[PDB]
Design a protein around this ligand. Structure first.
Ligand code: AKG
Ligand code: CL
Ligand code: FE
Length: 265
């Protein structure tokens, strides 16, 4: 599978100028979606923050002073929503916006492992700003009258993985953060696979998820990908589960009965 270098080629988006740099990168990002099926930006300084986060998650996975103390089935969950917490074995954690706000006891995993938790909250905030502006770019590619994506902070979650087939996300958008190793591969519009060069870089990839495929009525296919020789993290952005779905069919906004929560089930 051919390598796809992105360092120095994707638009640069600086940590303390995200909104303005994303505005300037808009046309480049549109052309990536049109020409690749996924999007990319280089974010100077993100790699350091993500590597530290990942490396501290790896340390926490071996501690006993223990992450399975915060397995999803013993962590307070929202009445309506997904499932944050730790998923033992290949082993990963879901750090939701709600969890970062302690919505109460749900933030205990971060109090128990506050070095990892401080990095994860930081990376969540950056990734959520990025992905919200990626969503604005995609929205601007959609017909006039397209509603705002309305990504929800509480329902969005950051996944961090410790030991790892073709698939796409179910949610609105995903933001792949630079992994520890190479192997993540994406399919182009012609059915050929490429391997973005992202390990140990500052490059983030933005994925179309199946919720946005549905909302855009098929205009944007999911950013299908797979992993093939180890740590990794990705933000999964969701709208509010209780909001009713919508769909832009042939230029017409149609409000459906089902909710976004129904889409997942
Ligand atoms: O394991 C990785 O490097 C990325 C896994 C993946 O597909 C994702 O986080 O969405
Ligand atoms: Cl995914
Ligand atoms: Fe994935």
């Amino acid at each position: 599978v051919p390598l796809m270098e992105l360092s120095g080629r994707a638009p640069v988006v600086r940590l303390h100028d995200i909104e303005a740099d994303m505005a300037a990168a808009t046309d480049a990002i549109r052309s990536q979606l049109t020409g690749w099926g996924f999007m990319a930006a280089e974010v100077p300084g993100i790699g350091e923050r993500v590597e530290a986060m990942m490396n501290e998650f790896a340390a926490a996975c071996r501690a006993t002073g223990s992450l399975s103390d915060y397995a999803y089935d013993v962590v307070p969950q929202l009445a309506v929503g997904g499932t944050h917490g730790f998923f033992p074995y290949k082993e990963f954690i879901h750090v939701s916006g709600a969890m970062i706000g302690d919505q109460p006891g749900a933030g205990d995993v971060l109090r128990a492992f506050p070095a990892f938790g401080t990095r994860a909250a930081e990376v969540f905030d950056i990734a959520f700003r990025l992905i919200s502006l990626f969503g604005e770019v995609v929205r601007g590619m959609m017909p006039p009258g397209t509603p705002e994506l309305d990504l929800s902070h509480d329902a969005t979650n950051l996944r961090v993985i410790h030991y790892r087939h073709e698939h796409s996300g179910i949610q609105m958008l995903g933001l792949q953060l630079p992994p520890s190793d190479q192997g993540l591969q994406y399919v182009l519009h012609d059915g050929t696979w490429v391997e973005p060069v992202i390990a140990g870089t500052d490059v983030v990839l933005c994925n179309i998820g199946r919720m946005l495929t549905s909302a855009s009525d098929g205009r944007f296919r999911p950013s299908t990908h797979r992993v093939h020789k180890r740590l990794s993290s990705v933000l999964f952005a969701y709208p509010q589960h209780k909001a009713r779905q919508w769909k832009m069919v042939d230029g017409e906004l149609m409000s459906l009965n089902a909710t976004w929560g129904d889409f997942i089930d």
